[PDB]
Amino acid sequence: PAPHGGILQDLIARDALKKNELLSEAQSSDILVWNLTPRQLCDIELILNGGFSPLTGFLNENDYSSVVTDSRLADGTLWTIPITLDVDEAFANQIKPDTRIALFQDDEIPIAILTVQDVYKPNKTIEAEKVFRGDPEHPAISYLFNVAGDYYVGGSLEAIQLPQHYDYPGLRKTPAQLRLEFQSRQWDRVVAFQTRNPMHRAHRELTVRAAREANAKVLIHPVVGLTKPGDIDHHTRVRVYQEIIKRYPNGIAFLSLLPLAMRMSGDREAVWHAIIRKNYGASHFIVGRDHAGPGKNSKGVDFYGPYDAQELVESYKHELDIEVVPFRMVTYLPDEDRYAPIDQIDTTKTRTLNISGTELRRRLRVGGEIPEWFSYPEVVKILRESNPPRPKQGFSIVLGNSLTVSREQLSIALLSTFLQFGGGRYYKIFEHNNKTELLSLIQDFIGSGSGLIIPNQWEDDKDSVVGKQNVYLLDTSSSADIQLESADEPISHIVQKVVLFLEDNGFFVF
Amino acid sequence: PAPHGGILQDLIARDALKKNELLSEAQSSDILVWNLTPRQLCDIELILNGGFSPLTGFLNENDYSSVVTDSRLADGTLWTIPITLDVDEAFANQIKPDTRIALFQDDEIPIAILTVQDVYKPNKTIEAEKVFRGDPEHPAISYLFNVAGDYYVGGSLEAIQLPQHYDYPGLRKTPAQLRLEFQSRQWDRVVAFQTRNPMHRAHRELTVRAAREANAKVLIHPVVGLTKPGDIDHHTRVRVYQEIIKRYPNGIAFLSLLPLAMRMSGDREAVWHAIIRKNYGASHFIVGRDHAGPGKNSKGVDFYGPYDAQELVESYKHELDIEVVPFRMVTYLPDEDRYAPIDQIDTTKTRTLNISGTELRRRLRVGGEIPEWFSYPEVVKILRESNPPRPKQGFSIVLGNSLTVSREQLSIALLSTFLQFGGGRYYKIFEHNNKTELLSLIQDFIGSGSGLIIPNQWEDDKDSVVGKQNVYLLDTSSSADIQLESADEPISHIVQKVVLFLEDNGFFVF
Amino acid sequence: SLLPLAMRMSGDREAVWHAIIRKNYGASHFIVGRDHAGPGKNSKGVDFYGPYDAQELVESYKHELDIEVVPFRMVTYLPDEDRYAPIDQIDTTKTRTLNISGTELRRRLRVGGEIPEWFSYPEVVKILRESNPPRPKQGFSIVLGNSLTVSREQLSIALLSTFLQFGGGRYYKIFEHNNKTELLSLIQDFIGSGSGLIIPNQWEDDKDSVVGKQNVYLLDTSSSADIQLESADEPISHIVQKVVLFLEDNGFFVF
Ligand SMILES: Nc1ncnc2c1ncn2[C@@H]1O[C@H](COP(=O)(O)OP(=O)(O)O)[C@@H](O)[C@H]1O
Ligand SMILES: Nc1ncnc2c1ncn2[C@@H]1O[C@H](COP(=O)(O)OP(=O)(O)O)[C@@H](O)[C@H]1O
Ligand SMILES: Nc1ncnc2c1ncn2[C@@H]1O[C@H](COP(=O)(O)OP(=O)(O)O)[C@@H](O)[C@H]1O
Ligand SMILES: [Ca+2]
Ligand SMILES: [Ca+2]
Ligand SMILES: [Ca+2]
C-alpha cells in the first residue's frame, strides 16, 4: 500500500544534495547542538527514512496535543503515539523558533538539522493518562517521568545521515530498501510480524497460518531499537530470529530489523505498528494476543485487555489501509501434537498446554529443560547461552554495615571457601571505596559470571550506580538477604550460612 | 623414621602454655612488627609445626652461610635449602640482636615472636649461583632478586598459632597429626609422592609401582603453598587430587596437603623434600624424572639434568634416613596399552608415547581432546573447567596511541560487532584513565572471561600494574599485536582486522 | 546344521575325512582354507601342519573324493580398501593387510579390550564377551601356601574383608577343602561362576589333578609361587597389599 499520508518521507533521499551543506552547518562553531538520547536516536531514524511517514520532524504542540487527545495529527491523519524531542530546561532556554539545532549522535556524528517551530512544556500527567492509560508502572509512563526531558522541541528535520550501526549492517532495511527487496522478488502480498521476544514454535506456526490465510509472503520484522526493560537483548534475539527463519519453507520469509523504540502502548501501539509496517511496504500486519502490551502491574492487573489492540485496530480498519490478520491465543495441543488458535479448539473436549514467559524465564534460570514441542532446540541453546542457569550466573555478597567481625578475614574466608568448590567461576574481593567508577563495575563482573566479595556497603547516595541483580546483603538487619544471628557471629558460622544460601539459590551445585 | 635431627620441633605443642602470654606481647603497643610475606607464611608454618626440623627459627648468617656453601647447617646437619626472613633496609635498621619482633599475617593475625640473633645483608649472587645454579631465569633466582628483601633477620621462634587457612581445613595435616593418622591405621611403611601439577595416568601408575615395590601405603603429599609461577592453581589441583585418589584400591592411599613454598631447586630441593617428608612421618620418598626442576630456560637448556636430583639424593643416602624410590621416565606404551619406566622397556623394539606439559597446556587452550589413556576424564574435566579453551577465554583490545581515528567510534564499532557474535562472553569499553585502581582490574575481567575494549594506552610507569595475558595492542607500530596499515585506516577495515585476528586466535568460533 | 563330530585336529588327514563326511551329508562342494583342522603350533612354536598341507592332500585325492573342493588362501583384511580378500589375490607389496589372530582375540576378550568393527560383527563379539568375560568379571582363587607361618584364619578373614570393600559384583568365600575331592572339584565351578575364593591351605599332591589350575594362584615364599612372600612370617597387612596389587595388576580389580 501507499505510505501513510501518501508520500514516503525518505528525507535521506530528499536531502541528498544538501548533505555536504548540512554537514558543514552541523559542524559550525555557532550552531546550537543537542546530542540525541537512545530513544531519540531510535525515533529520528524512523523519521528520516520515511518509517514515520507522514512525519518529517518532531511534533510541535499542535500536532502533539491532537495525537494525545485525538489519536490523530492536527490535520486529522490517524496517528496514536506522540514522537517528540524532549530536552531539559537548560537547553530549552536557548531555543527560539526559527532557530536551527544540529542533532548529534554520541557527540560525534552529525545526524540532522532541526528547524525549531516551538518549545513547549507538556503536561506529563495528561500524556501518561490519555496515551499510556496512567498506570505508573507502565513502561512508557515511567520513562516519561523518569527519563524524558520536561520540554519538547517541535520542528522540521533535514537529513544528513541515519544513526550509525556497526552490528547487523545489511539487515536494517529502510522502507525504500525493503520495498525494493519485495519488488525484486515480485512479492505483491507481504504479511509482517512484529516481535520483541524470541520466537518459538507457536510463533512460527502462527506466522505461517497468516501467510497461508493471507496468501502472502512472510516478513519477520523484529524490533531492535528499544523495547521493555528486562527483555532479551536484541543481539541474542537476532540470532534466535536468523535461526528460526531456517524453519520456514525455502523462499517464503524475509528478515529485516526495525530500529523502532517501542512504547509498550498496547492498542495505540498496535495502530502505530500497522502504520509503520505499511510505510515499510507490507500489505498485511499480524496482531495477536496482547499486542505490544507490558503484561500486568505488580498488583496482577492487566495494562491492556488481551485483545484491546485487535479491537482498536479493527475500529480504524478503513483508515489504516493495510490488512490486519488477527489471532486468538495460539496454544499447544498435546494429544494432537500441534498448535492452533484457542478460538478454533473446544477448550472443553481438548487439552491445551502453555509455557508462559515467566515460566520460561524460570527454566532458563534453573537450567530446567524446555520441551522439544515448545521451541526449537537451537533457539533454546542460544537463549541459554546469553541467559545462563544459576550455576553459571555471577553474584555479589556484601558484608553489611552491622557486621562486627573482621571484614578482611571474613572476606578471605569467603574467598578461599568459594575457591575450593571449583567449577569455573571467577572470584574477587572487590573494594569500591564508594568510588562510583568502581561501583559501576559491580554489575559488569556479575554479568561476566563472577562472584564478588564486597567488604562493606556503599553510601546510599551512590546506590543508584549499582545494579541490584544478584547482589545479596549479609547483615543482622531484618532486610538482609542472608541474615546473621548477631554482628559478632563467628566467621566459620557466617561462611556456612552464605555457602548454603548460595547453594539454595542455584549458584553452587555439588 | 625419626624427624631430622632426632626431635620433632612442633613449636605449637612446645609453646602451648605461652600462647596467651606471647599473644599479649605480640599485641603490645611497643613491640616491633613485621607482616609476613606469602613465602614467609609458607616457611614459618613449616618451622612452627616441625616440618623443618631441626630448624626452630629463621637461619642466622652462620647457619645460612653453611647451607649455601656446605648444604649443611653449621653443626653439620644435612640441609640444602636456606630458609630466611628477608626484610628491607628500613625495617632492618630498627633491629638489634636480643630484639623481639612480632610476626603477623595479613597485619591482623599474630603468628609468632622472633628473637633476633642477627641482621645480615646476604650476597644474593652467591646464593643465586651456589644454591640455585645461577641461571637468571631460574624461579628461585628471579624471586631472590625481584621479591626477596635485601636483609635477612636470623633468630629463634616462639609459636602463637599456625598461619590461618579457610580452605581445605582438615586436609593440611601437621607432621604430628599425619604421624597419628598413619599410626591409627597401623601404617608402618609409607611412600610419599611430592607433586605440584595435576596427576595423570602415569602418576597413578608410578605411585602404585612404588607402593608395590616398597611394600608401603601411599601418601599423596601435594604442595599447596607456592610453586612455580604459571602452575595450575592449588584449588584446581586439590580437586584433581581428591578425584584421582578414588582410582587407587580402597585403603591404600592418604591425601594430605603440604603448605610448603617450593624453590624449584631441582636436586637440592629433592634432598630437602626427603627431609621434610621424613619429618612428616614417611618411610619412603619417590624421586622421579627432573624432580623439582623448572624445566628449561628460554634458550632451551636444562636448569637441572633429568636425574640430577636422583643422583644427589643417592649420594646423601645413608644420611637421609628415609628410603628413596627412584623412577626413570614413566611413559606410555600404545601397543601394550600400559605405562612403565623407560629403563624397563627397549625403546628399540617397543613404541612409546608422551604428551608433555607444553602439549597439554596447548590442548586445553584450543579445546583439543586429551587421550583417554593420558589422564582420567574427570581430571581433564576439572582442568578444562579452570583452564578454559580460547572460545571461553577473556581478552582485551587496546586502541594504540598511534591511532588517529575516533577512539569513541572505533570502540563502539568493536563493541557492537563482538555483540552480534553471541556465545556467552561479556564485553565492555573499559576506560582506565591511567588510574591503577582500574588498570589492576583489567586481568580480573580477562580472568572472568570478558572481552574488554580499551580506548587508549596507559602510562609506561603504570604498565607493571597490568597483567599482559590476553591483552592485545592495535596499532601501526611494528610491535603491535594487531598491526594497522595506517593510523587513519577506516573503522570497518580495522574492525575486520580485529575480528579475524581474534577468530584466528580461537577467541571466536563460527 | 550342527555336526556332532568329534574332531581329531588331524590337519590334512582330517580335511580328507571332513570332505568324505560332508559328501555323505549331501554337500557338492567343501571349503578347505588355511591350516584346515590344524591345532596350530606346539609350545616350541613349530607348526603341527603346514598352512596348506590339508589343501595339498585333499588335492591329491581329488578324483577319488567325489566332492568338489573350494580352496582358499589366507583371507585377510585390507584397511585402505575396507574389505577382505584371499592373500593370493593381493600384492602384499603395494597393499597393506591387517590381521587379529586368535591369540590376539583371546587376549582382548580377557582384558576387555575393543575388537575392531571391521574384525567381527558386534552381536558376535557381545556373545563372545558374555561367555568369555574380561578379567574384572573373572573368578579366581588365592591359596595360602604351606610355607605360610602367619595365622591362616586371620589372613583369610583379612583377605575376605579387604576384597569385600572393593565392591563391584564378585562373590567371595573362604573355601576349606580339607583335601576332600568332592570339594576340590568345586573350586573351578566357583571360579567359573566368577567368584573369588580364599583357600586357607594347599591340598595333597595326589589330589592336585582334581583341581582346574585356571585362575588359581599360590601365595608362598616358594620361588614357584604366583604371589611370592618375602618371608613366611610376613605381617598380614603386608601380605594383603601384595595380594591386592597382584590381583589388580592382573585385571581382577579395577579402580
Ligand atoms: N500465543 C500467541 N497467540 C497469538 N499471538 C501471539 C502469541 N504470542 C505472541 N503473539 C503475537 O506476536 C506478536 C509479537 O509477540 P511479542 O514480541 O511477544 O509481543 P509484542 O507484541 O510486545 O511485540 C504480537 O502481535 C503478539 O500479540
Ligand atoms: N613421567 C614421569 N616419569 C618419572 N617421574 C615422573 C613423571 N612424571 C612426574 N614424575 C615425578 O613425580 C613427582 C611430582 O611430579 P611434578 O609435580 O610434575 O613435579 P615436581 O617435582 O616439581 O613436584 C616428581 O618426583 C617427578 O619427577
Ligand atoms: N583367515 C582365513 N583364511 C583362509 N581360511 C580360513 C581363515 N579363517 C578360517 N579359515 C578356514 O575356515 C574353516 C574353519 O575355520 P576354523 O574353525 O578356525 O578351523 P578348523 O578347520 O579347525 O574348523 C577352515 O577350512 C579354515 O582353514
Ligand atoms: Ca522532570
Ligand atoms: Ca489477563
Ligand atoms: Ca558477642
Ligand SMILES: [Ca+2]
Ligand atoms: Ca635488591
Ligand SMILES: [Ca+2]
Ligand atoms: Ca634434556
Ligand SMILES: [Ca+2]
Ligand atoms: Ca590517510
Ligand SMILES: [Ca+2]
Ligand atoms: Ca608357519
Ligand SMILES: [Ca+2]
Ligand atoms: Ca621373622
Ligand SMILES: [Mg+2]
Ligand atoms: Mg542506524
Ligand SMILES: [Mg+2]
Ligand atoms: Mg507478548
Ligand SMILES: [Mg+2]
Ligand atoms: Mg595456614
Ligand SMILES: [Mg+2]
Ligand atoms: Mg616436573
Ligand SMILES: [Mg+2]
Ligand atoms: Mg583353524
Ligand code: NA
Ligand atoms: Na490502498
Ligand code: NA
Ligand atoms: Na566525546
Ligand code: NA
Ligand atoms: Na487526571
Ligand code: NA
Ligand atoms: Na484480503
Ligand code: NA
Ligand atoms: Na479493554
Ligand code: NA
Ligand atoms: Na530453599
